Amino acid sequence: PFFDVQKRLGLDLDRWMTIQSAEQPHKIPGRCHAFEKEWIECAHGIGGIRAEK
Amino acid sequence: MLKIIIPTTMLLPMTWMSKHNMIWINATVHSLLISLISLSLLNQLGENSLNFSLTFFSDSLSAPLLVLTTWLLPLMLMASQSHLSKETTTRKKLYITMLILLQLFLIMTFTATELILFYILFEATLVPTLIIITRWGNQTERLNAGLYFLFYTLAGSLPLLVALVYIQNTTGSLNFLIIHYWSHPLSNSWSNIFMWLACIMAFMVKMPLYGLHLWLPKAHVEAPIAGSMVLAAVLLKLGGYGMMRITTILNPLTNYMAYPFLMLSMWGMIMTSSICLRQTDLKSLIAYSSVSHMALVIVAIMIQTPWSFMGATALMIAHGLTSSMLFCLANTNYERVHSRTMILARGLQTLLPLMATWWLVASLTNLALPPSINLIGELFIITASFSWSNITIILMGMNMMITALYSLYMLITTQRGKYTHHINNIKPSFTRENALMALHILPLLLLTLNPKMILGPLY
Amino acid sequence: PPEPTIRLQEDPDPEDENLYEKNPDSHGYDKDPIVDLWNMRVVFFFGFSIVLVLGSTFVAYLPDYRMQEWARREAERLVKYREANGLPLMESNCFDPNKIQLPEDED
Amino acid sequence: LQYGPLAFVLGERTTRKLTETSKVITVDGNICSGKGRLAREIAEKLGLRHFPEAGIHYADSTTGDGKPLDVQLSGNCSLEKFYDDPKSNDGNSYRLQSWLYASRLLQYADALEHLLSTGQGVVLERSIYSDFVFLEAMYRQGFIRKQCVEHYNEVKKVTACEYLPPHVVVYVDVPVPEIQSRIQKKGNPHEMKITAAYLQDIENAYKKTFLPEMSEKCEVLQYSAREAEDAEKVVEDIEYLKCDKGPWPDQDDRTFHRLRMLVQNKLEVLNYTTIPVYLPEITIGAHQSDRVFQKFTELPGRKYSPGYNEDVGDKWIWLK
Amino acid sequence: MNPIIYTTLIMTVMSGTMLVMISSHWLLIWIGFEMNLLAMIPVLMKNFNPRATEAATKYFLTQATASMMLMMAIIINLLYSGQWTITKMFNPVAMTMMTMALAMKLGLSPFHFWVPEVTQGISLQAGLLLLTWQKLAPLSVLCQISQSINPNLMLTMAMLSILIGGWGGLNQTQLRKIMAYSSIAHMGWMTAVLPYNTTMTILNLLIYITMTLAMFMLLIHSSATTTLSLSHTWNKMPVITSLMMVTLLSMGGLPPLSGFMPKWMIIQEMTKNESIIMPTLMAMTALLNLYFYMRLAYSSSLTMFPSTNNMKMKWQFEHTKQMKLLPTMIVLSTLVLPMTPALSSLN
Amino acid sequence: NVLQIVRDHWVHILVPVGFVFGCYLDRRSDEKLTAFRNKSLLFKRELRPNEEVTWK
Amino acid sequence: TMMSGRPGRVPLQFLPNEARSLPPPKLTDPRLVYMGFLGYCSGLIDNAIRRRPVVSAGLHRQLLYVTSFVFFGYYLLKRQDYMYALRDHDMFAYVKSHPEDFPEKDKKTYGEILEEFHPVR
Amino acid sequence: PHGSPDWLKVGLTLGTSVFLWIYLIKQHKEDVLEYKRRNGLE
Numbered sequence A: 001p002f003f004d005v006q007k008r009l010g011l012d013l014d015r016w017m018t019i020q021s022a023e024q025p026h027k028i029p030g031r032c033h034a035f036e037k038e039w040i041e042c043a044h045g046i047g048g049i050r051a052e053k
Numbered sequence B: 001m002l003k004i005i006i007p008t009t010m011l012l013p014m015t016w017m018s019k020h021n022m023i024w025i026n027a028t029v030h031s032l033l034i035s036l037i038s039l040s041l042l043n044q045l046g047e048n049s050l051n052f053s054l055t056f057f058s059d060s061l062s063a064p065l066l067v068l069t070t071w072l073l074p075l076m077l078m079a080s081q082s083h084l085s086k087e088t089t090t091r092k093k094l095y096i097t098m099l100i101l102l103q104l105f106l107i108m109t110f111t112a113t114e115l116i117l118f119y120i121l122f123e124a125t126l127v128p129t130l131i132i133i134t135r136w137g138n139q140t141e142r143l144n145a146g147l148y149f150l151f152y153t154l155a156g157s158l159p160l161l162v163a164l165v166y167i168q169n170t171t172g173s174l175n176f177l178i179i180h181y182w183s184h185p186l187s188n189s190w191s192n193i194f195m196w197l198a199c200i201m202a203f204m205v206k207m208p209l210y211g212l213h214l215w216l217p218k219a220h221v222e223a224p225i226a227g228s229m230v231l232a233a234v235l236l237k238l239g240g241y242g243m244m245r246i247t248t249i250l251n252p253l254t255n256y257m258a259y260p261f262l263m264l265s266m267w268g269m270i271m272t273s274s275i276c277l278r279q280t281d282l283k284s285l286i287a288y289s290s291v292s293h294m295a296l297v298i299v300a301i302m303i304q305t306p307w308s309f310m311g312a313t314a315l316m317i318a319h320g321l322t323s324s325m326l327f328c329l330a331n332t333n334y335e336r337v338h339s340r341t342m343i344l345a346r347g348l349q350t351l352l353p354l355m356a357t358w359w360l361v362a363s364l365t366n367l368a369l370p371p372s373i374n375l376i377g378e379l380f381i382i383t384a385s386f387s388w389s390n391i392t393i394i395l396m397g398m399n400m401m402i403t404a405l406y407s408l409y410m411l412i413t414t415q416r417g418k419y420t421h422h423i424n425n426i427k428p429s430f431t432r433e434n435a436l437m438a439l440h441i442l443p444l445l446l447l448t449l450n451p452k453m454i455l456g457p458l459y
Numbered sequence C: 001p002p003e004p005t006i007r008l009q010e011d012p013d014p015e016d017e018n019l020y021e022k023n024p025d026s027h028g029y030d031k032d033p034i035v036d037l038w039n040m041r042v043v044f045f046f047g048f049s050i051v052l053v054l055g056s057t058f059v060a061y062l063p064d065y066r067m068q069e070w071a072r073r074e075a076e077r078l079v080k081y082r083e084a085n086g087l088p089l090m091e092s093n094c095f096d097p098n099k100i101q102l103p104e105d106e107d
Numbered sequence D: 001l002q003y004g005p006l007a008f009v010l011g012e013r014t015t016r017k018l019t020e021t022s023k024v025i026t027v028d029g030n031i032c033s034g035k036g037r038l039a040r041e042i043a044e045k046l047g048l049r050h051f052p053e054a055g056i057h058y059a060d061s062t063t064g065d066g067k068p069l070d071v072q073l074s075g076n077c078s079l080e081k082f083y084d085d086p087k088s089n090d091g092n093s094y095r096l097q098s099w100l101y102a103s104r105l106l107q108y109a110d111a112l113e114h115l116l117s118t119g120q121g122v123v124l125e126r127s128i129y130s131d132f133v134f135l136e137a138m139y140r141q142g143f144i145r146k147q148c149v150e151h152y153n154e155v156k157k158v159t160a161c162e163y164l165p166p167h168v169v170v171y172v173d174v175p176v177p178e179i180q181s182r183i184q185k186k187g188n189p190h191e192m193k194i195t196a197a198y199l200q201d202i203e204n205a206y207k208k209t210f211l212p213e214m215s216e217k218c219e220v221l222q223y224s225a226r227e228a229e230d231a232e233k234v235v236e237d238i239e240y241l242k243c244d245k246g247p248w249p250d251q252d253d254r255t256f257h258r259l260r261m262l263v264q265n266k267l268e269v270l271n272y273t274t275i276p277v278y279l280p281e282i283t284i285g286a287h288q289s290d291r292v293f294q295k296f297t298e299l300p301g302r303k304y305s306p307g308y309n310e311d312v313g314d315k316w317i318w319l320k
Numbered sequence E: 001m002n003p004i005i006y007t008t009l010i011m012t013v014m015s016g017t018m019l020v021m022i023s024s025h026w027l028l029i030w031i032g033f034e035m036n037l038l039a040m041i042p043v044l045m046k047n048f049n050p051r052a053t054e055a056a057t058k059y060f061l062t063q064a065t066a067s068m069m070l071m072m073a074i075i076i077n078l079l080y081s082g083q084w085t086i087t088k089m090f091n092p093v094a095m096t097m098m099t100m101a102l103a104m105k106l107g108l109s110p111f112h113f114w115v116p117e118v119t120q121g122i123s124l125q126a127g128l129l130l131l132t133w134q135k136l137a138p139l140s141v142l143c144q145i146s147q148s149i150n151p152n153l154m155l156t157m158a159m160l161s162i163l164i165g166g167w168g169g170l171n172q173t174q175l176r177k178i179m180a181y182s183s184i185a186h187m188g189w190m191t192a193v194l195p196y197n198t199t200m201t202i203l204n205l206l207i208y209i210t211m212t213l214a215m216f217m218l219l220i221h222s223s224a225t226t227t228l229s230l231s232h233t234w235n236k237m238p239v240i241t242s243l244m245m246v247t248l249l250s251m252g253g254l255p256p257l258s259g260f261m262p263k264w265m266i267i268q269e270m271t272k273n274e275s276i277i278m279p280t281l282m283a284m285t286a287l288l289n290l291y292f293y294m295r296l297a298y299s300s301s302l303t304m305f306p307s308t309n310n311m312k313m314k315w316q317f318e319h320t321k322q323m324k325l326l327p328t329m330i331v332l333s334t335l336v337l338p339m340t341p342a343l344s345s346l347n
Numbered sequence F: 001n002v003l004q005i006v007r008d009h010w011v012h013i014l015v016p017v018g019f020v021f022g023c024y025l026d027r028r029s030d031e032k033l034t035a036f037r038n039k040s041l042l043f044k045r046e047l048r049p050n051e052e053v054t055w056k
Numbered sequence G: 001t002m003m004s005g006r007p008g009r010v011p012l013q014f015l016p017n018e019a020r021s022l023p024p025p026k027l028t029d030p031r032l033v034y035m036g037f038l039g040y041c042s043g044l045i046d047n048a049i050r051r052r053p054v055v056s057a058g059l060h061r062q063l064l065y066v067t068s069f070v071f072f073g074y075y076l077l078k079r080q081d082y083m084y085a086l087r088d089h090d091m092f093a094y095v096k097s098h099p100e101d102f103p104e105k106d107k108k109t110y111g112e113i114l115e116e117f118h119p120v121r
Numbered sequence H: 001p002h003g004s005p006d007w008l009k010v011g012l013t014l015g016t017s018v019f020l021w022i023y024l025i026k027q028h029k030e031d032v033l034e035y036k037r038r039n040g041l042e
């Protein structure tokens, strides 16, 4: 299935476009930058299940 | 246990690297030697078992079946040597390879410490038999017979795999030793009822049960002589062995559950013995006699008493040998007549006296004449059934009488009377056929001297 | 109807061949007399001579791993002792009741 | 390096091998006409390669040794029996026709392979084209049934829809009484029994169907017996004419690559000559098929692959 | 076509599949699907005839509709959560539409109708590629988003696929339609274990791909596309018929053959999750696949059908092109049951 | 004649070789189940002056 | 047990470094012998398909098949053993870290347990 | 057809087999030594 080549090689092929709060050109912020930042920080490393609850 | 398995595996390269006219000689000699090797397993203990390793064990229920399975192969080779004469070397080697694979699967099936391994080998035995039936068969209905034999078995056995994996998920082990020591009662529940049915019907179909016995006449009539021998002698006993092995987990549910099967078998033995009276075919008659005997074995296993188990084991061994002999005799008649109908060739005692003597002995041992092991199993099962209920004897009585009738009927139609005037190609019986009958019959009369050797673990 | 009335080009069904005609003493094993005779000999020797005789003798003289004489001697010594003591033969209980802890009903 | 996609990718292009002299030509003559003599002189004069007319054992000449195999192991038919009893009960007539058509197909494939791999042109006798005239004559004389010609038409369509027609078709035209006279002068006792109606049907068939259909996609040179004697005029006519109406000018390198992969692997060339349609003249039972295949296998150099036969004398088997 | 063009198109198909498998962004997954779709069409039309064109246009229509549904599911997911990463689906029926798109891509029921038609229209090599390689990407996506799927819908479509494949294989005389219905039934078996264990899905995929490769290469070697055309193979290559019969028995799920390993494991896995009735029904329905495999085996090697005269000439020639991997495929699809625990390698 | 009858009678040796190999394999597999040797409650025994293992 | 998401897992590592702390499979392992047997069967079928003497057509080809099968089998067995070791390690660690979910059952002798008896009649 | 044993392919096959066997033996030895060193056996 998913072969995580980007993490193995450190290429960053498409991770720059996945979320709103990831290095937009000219530092233009998304409409919900703070909320997405908070939700991502809270759920980092917790895992999807514990993250969901 | 590998001291038996490895020579059986080596039988294949030896056969395929054999000279074009030395396959039969090499195969028979090494099969007889392997049979001699198998005899060591007979010295059982009154204790648990002969646990060789984590994968294979021996038991005094498994040991007689293993010895019979090993002994059957030289007989099958000698029987098949005749009608495969005009056949290419490659296809004869393929036939011998299929027989060797069948023996190997049966040997691994009978030891089988684990139930999933037992199921895998139990269903692996199906492919060589199907190919033998559908490839080296004479009539055009061998394809339909093979389809019936395959699909009855698989329809019976597919729920068994689900039941086994569920049982391992709950209990945690499928090992026979662990299951026996950790057995716990099954509550009378609908789920437990269906689990019982799934555990039992797979072995019930192969006996076969009276309701599910249709595949057997087709498979026996359409298979070659080796196929008929292996079906009647060993393949039918797989269901009985499986039931005796798996019934331990089933109690106390078996008592309520057993009635539909007990009634079906007690009436089906009468039905099939009566069917034998009006038959125009030798092979079909022998097949129906086998069905009756295995119905009695089903009754014995379902009663589930010590005497029942000893009688069932003895009857299984005796029936295997007797039915193999009967099929061999019918095939010897067929190879001369090419009709395979009783009423055509008559009065064969006048032309072939020694073969008529063999016919008489085979019919007597099918008739359960004392003190043969056939009657030993017969009487043990009858006594156990009488203790179970004093009315069963009546049915048993009828069965015995009917059995004798058709047995002597088969002896009288083909051997006594006046020989058909037109048939003139009845040549004197060969040494090979007489040796085949002698090797079939001598073990029975030797075993009646030592019955405990085939009475199972509950002796 | 110009059809040949033949469905296909087929070999005629051959007649059965007798092993006795081309070779008396044919033993019903093979058409080659040497292979015939040697197959007869090996079958007879490895079946009747080796298996049926030596194997039957081996099975007859198997050691008592079932422990029948052992059980007979144990029972003999046990009854000899019990009769003398005045003990009533075999007890009804297979296990001693003092080491069995029943659950109290209090119903 | 056996020819394949890799060879075509790297260097192998067959367009550069064409030097306007290839010009596949087929010569057709009526029974007892000297078509062969004319064709051999054409091949010698134009520098092409002559192909002798395909017989019953033509395929035997290209596989293993060139010596023909047994009649039952190759063809299962004879022309002598067809001449003696054209209305034979065992259906030898249509079996003969089908085997001859298959041999002609194999011959055409071999000629095309040689022409594409070397560039040297070839000269042929009766090819898969115009082979139907014998079929038509045999049907009209009552030698074969309508199912036979239907099966022949099916096989011919499926096979011949994959090849390029010959550049030039050369026909030698000879009268029926004259060819009968040549038949008696030949001296073959079996050939003496050919009736005038059969030759007339066959002769008639070439003119009625073969010339008109091939005139729209090939170039035709109708010749008489006298003017076919001198091959100088024949070669002069061949050289003067230029082919621009057939499918050949439209072909390119990739079409030639596909055709060259087609002509190789003769098994796929003959794939549709054994289609599962059951005509009693050609269908063979299981027992006879098994016995004949076993006999073919027991041939000296046919049990294994060509390089893996010990009895023939192939060495180093255990290291090939 | 030009061999260079064919190689480029095959590499483009494989690169699209790899782009689907390695990317974490939904747009890149859709782009990989588009690339695979674009490069697959000429491969189905290598042999130009109206049948191949019809098969190619049917395949294009189905796959384009599936891609549009996939994009709609992605956009709805983005609307309800500003995420592009392939993770839990984050939404209701957006997941339903994603599952429908992936089912149409895979050929699962009720979107099974195009598989037999496209397989019949195209040649045997194109059918081999279509039935083997075109399952990796959608199954990879489904394995990635397996925790999101509603078990009811996935199990319903899996059972429907098994039933439809079993019933539709019984009526076929063409070999390619038989292979297509076999593929439908095998995909049904594969997707019924996705809600519980994706490793079992991958194991079933590997075993099925091996068996299908062996079967298609055997069919190509003995160039027959019909039951009767296959019935003539014994008169030339009896060993091919024997290997084919063994492979067909393996595909039927018979022990001790290799094809028994997936179903067994799958059944086992489904019993760990307190599911019995569906495994029972799946086995009883796969009995039908076994029946038509066994009929093909009867017509192939267990009986000798009548032959033709011209067959004799085929006795004098040998196959110029030989398939190197065919021997290995047969052994792997026949004799790998004892190596079953190796599935812990997370294949 | 030696070196000639061997090429035809070599096959006979295979079954006995399989038997001895199976016996050796049975002993070798037995060697891996010695965890309870001379430890059963029924057969706790003190080793002989020149004995290392009760059974092999 | 989906171990794809295990923390500290290199994405495309066939055999991680920590797998080197496990005993390698012996060269006489029965599974390696079975893989070699599979390679030998592949060689025999290869000889049979191309119409060559099955037993003695190509010795180099059969040797190559057997050797490649043994090589791949050895590495596959290493990965198998490593993955099973990981599963057992995780299970034991989880049992250790969650005592309240796996209580120590009070040992009870059969002499003080009442099991219902069903006669066989 | 008419061909000699291709000594190039034979040499390549034997060399590949011998190299694979030697590399496998070396890998097994290194694995055994590394396991012993990690678990501190010898």
Ligand SMILES: CCCCCCCCCCCCCCCCCC(=O)OC[C@H](COP(=O)([O-])OCC(O)COP(=O)([O-])OC[C@@H](COC(=O)CCCCCCCCCCCCCCCCC)OC(=O)CCCCCCCCCCCCCCCCC)OC(=O)CCCCCCCCCCCCCCCCC
Pocket (backbone or CB within 6 Å): B009, B012, B013, B014, B016, B017, B090, B091, B094, B097, B101, B104, B127, B128, B131, B135, E238, E239, E242, E243, E245, E246, E256, E301, E302, E334, F014, F017, G040, G041, G042, G044, G045, G048, G052, G053, G054, G055
């Ligand atoms: C349980 C595990 C233990 C056992 C393992 C079981 C499997 C093992 C083998 C697996 C496959 C490998 C070999 C198969 C390749 C096929 C080649 C072949 O056909 O044989 C010809 C060849 C002889 O013929 P040839 O002179 O070369 O040329 C004739 C042509 O080849 C051909 O002549 P033809 O074309 O004119 O003849 C036509 C014939 C020829 O067609 C065939 O024979 C096809 C071959 C069978 C298909 C194989 C499928 C793949 C394997 C599946 C195995 C299934 C097992 C699971 C249970 C289910 C049972 C189906 O086909 C037919 O007649 C059509 C109808 C056939 C009837 C129905 C088909 C059923 C076949 C199923 C057979 C299953 C068992 C096979 C056992 C081995 C058979 C060779 O046989 C051999 O000589 C090789 C046999 C093995 C070599 C043994 C060497 C070892 C001895 C020295 C070392 C000592 C060992 C111990 C070391 C320490 C001691 C000091």
Ligand SMILES: CCCCCCCCCCCCCCCCC[C@@H](O)O[C@H](CO[C@H](O)CCCCCCCCCCCCCCC)COP(=O)(O)OCC[N+](C)(C)C
Pocket (backbone or CB within 6 Å): B188, B189, B190, B193, B210, B211, B212, B260, B261
């Ligand atoms: C065709 C050739 C032969 C094939 C094999 C035939 C053998 C299999 C037949 C199975 C035997 C009976 C199955 C279930 C028996 C349960 C006992 C029942 O009959 O007695 C009463 C049951 O009452 C009714 O029978 C309820 C069930 C009625 C529905 C069953 C269908 C009846 C006929 C169908 C026969 C078709 C069989 C073949 C299907 C393909 C007792 O009342 P109750 O105390 O409440 O239930 C006790 C069980 N508990 C404790 C688990 C709750």
Ligand SMILES: CCCCCCCCCCCCCCCCC[C@@H](O)O[C@H](CO[C@H](O)CCCCCCCCCCCCCCC)COP(=O)(O)OCC[N+](C)(C)C
Pocket (backbone or CB within 6 Å): B035, B064, B067, B068, B071, B317, B443, B446, B447, B449, B450, C051, C052, C055, C056, C057, C059, C060, C061, C062
């Ligand atoms: C032709 C006309 C007749 C001529 C010959 C006349 C002589 C007749 C004598 C023959 C039989 C008459 C009865 C005489 C019996 C005496 C021998 C008997 O006592 O020995 C039996 C011995 O026989 C064996 O127990 C039974 C034979 C073993 C059967 C195994 C079958 C052989 C293997 C072949 C393959 C198996 C195929 C079937 C698979 C199951 C019983 O022995 P047992 O009372 O206990 O104790 C022996 C002494 N102990 C205590 C020291 C041990």
Ligand SMILES: CCCCCCCCCCCCCCCCC[C@@H](O)O[C@H](CO[C@H](O)CCCCCCCCCCCCCCC)COP(=O)(O)OCC[N+](C)(C)C
Pocket (backbone or CB within 6 Å): A001, A002, A003, A004, E199, E202, E203, E206, E207, E210, E332, E333, E336, E339, E340, E341, E342, E343, E345, E346, E347, G004, G010, G011, G012, G013, G014, G076
């Ligand atoms: C049908 C029989 C199976 C044969 C299959 C083909 C055999 C030829 C393959 C040749 C070698 C392939 C190995 C690839 C080299 C490196 C692989 C490595 O980089 O990948 C790792 C993974 O290794 C491979 O997956 C292991 C493949 C080994 C397959 C063997 C199992 C076969 C099933 C049991 C049947 C026995 C077959 C024995 C005969 C071959 C990391 O995976 P990861 O990025 O972290 O997660 C993706 C996978 N997930 C999502 C499932 C977790």
Ligand SMILES: CCCCCCCC/C=C/CCCCCCCC(=O)OC[C@H](COP(=O)(O)OCCN)OC(=O)CCCCCCC/C=C/CCCCCCCC
Pocket (backbone or CB within 6 Å): B152, B155, B156, B157, B159, B162, B163, B166, B190, B191, B192, B194, B195, B196, B197, B198, B201, B205, B212, E274, E275, E276, E277, E280
């Ligand atoms: C002729 C054979 C006898 C047939 C008698 C009945 C025939 C009619 C039945 C048709 C098939 C019915 C399929 C659905 C049955 C559902 C049974 C079931 O689910 O019980 C499973 C039970 C408990 O379920 P859980 O949810 O896990 O328990 C938790 C709560 N206690 O667990 C088990 O025992 C699993 C065992 C599998 C059951 C077998 C199902 C098939 C029917 C039994 C076999 C009888 C038919 C044999 C065919 C004979 C042909 C030779």
Ligand SMILES: Nc1ncnc2c1ncn2[C@@H]1O[C@H](COP(=O)(O)OP(=O)(O)O)[C@@H](O)[C@H]1O
Pocket (backbone or CB within 6 Å): D029, D030, D031, D032, D033, D034, D035, D036, D097, D100, D126, D131, D134, D135, D191
């Ligand atoms: N399509 C065909 N059908 C039947 N016989 C054919 C066919 N084609 C060629 N022949 C036979 O080939 C034989 C030789 O051909 P022909 O040109 O007449 O003699 P020659 O080879 O001496 O020039 C003829 O006897 C003819 O019958």
